[PDB]
Amino acid sequence: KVFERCELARTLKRLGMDGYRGISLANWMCLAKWESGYNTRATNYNAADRSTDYGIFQINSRYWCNDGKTPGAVNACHLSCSALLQDNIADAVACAKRVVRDPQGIRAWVAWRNRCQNRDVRQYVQGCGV
């Protein structure tokens, strides 16, 4: 599923993401926007290390979910990577929360550092009623 902007903002708010571990909804929107264009079925294989990024947040198989084909990988979210490809994003959200419970927080995603950090991210949630 490819979410429309405001639809996703409200979906994330309903799932408890607004201010989760200090991260505003607009930061999560900026992250989803740049990671996948709000696309839950997006996948990205990383030839260099044999891992794959899954879903709307492009969560990596090396540490977060199990896809069985990533060498010496772990599954910190304790989910099959398939769960990160559903139209319903509850599991992907549960996993993104797990990710940010670690020290780095939202900084875990380099795309967030490149396109969201220290930027005016208000536009991602404007007019969405969140």
From Swiss-Prot:
Catalytic activity: Hydrolysis of (1->4)-beta-linkages between N-acetylmuramic acid and N-acetyl-D-glucosamine residues in a peptidoglycan and between N-acetyl-D-glucosamine residues in chitodextrins
Keyword Transcription regulation: no
An example Gene Ontology biological process: inflammatory response
C-type lysozyme domain residues: 1-130
Keyword field: Amyloid, Amyloidosis, Antimicrobial, Bacteriolytic enzyme, Disease variant, Disulfide bond, Glycosidase, Hydrolase, Secreted, Signal
Pfam family, any one: Lys
InterPro entries recorded: Glyco_hydro_22 (IPR001916), Glyco_hydro_22_CS (IPR019799), Glyco_hydro_22_lys (IPR000974), Lysozyme-like_dom_sf (IPR023346)
Subcellular location: Secreted
EC code(s) of this entry: 3.2.1.17
GO molecular function: identical protein binding; lysozyme activity
Catalytic residues identified in the record: E35, D53
Regions annotated as coiled coil: none
Tree of life domain: Eukaryota
Disulfide bond sites: C6-C128, C30-C116, C65-C81, C77-C95
Gene Ontology cellular component terms for the protein in this record: azurophil granule lumen; extracellular exosome; extracellular region; extracellular space; specific granule lumen; tertiary granule lumen
Stated family: Belongs to the glycosyl hydrolase 22 family.
Disease: Amyloidosis, hereditary systemic 5: A form of hereditary systemic amyloidosis, a disorder characterized by amyloid deposition in multiple tissues resulting in a wide clinical spectrum. AMYLD5 primarily affects the viscera, and the predominant clinical features are renal dysfunction of varying severity, and intra-abdominal bleeding. Inheritance is autosomal dominant.
Extra facts: Lysozyme C is capable of both hydrolysis and transglycosylation; it also shows a slight esterase activity. It acts rapidly on both peptide-substituted and unsubstituted peptidoglycan, and slowly on chitin oligosaccharides.
Subunit structure, interactors included: Monomer.
Protein function: Lysozymes have primarily a bacteriolytic function; those in tissues and body fluids are associated with the monocyte-macrophage system and enhance the activity of immunoagents.
Protein name, per record: Lysozyme C
Organism: Homo sapiens (Human)
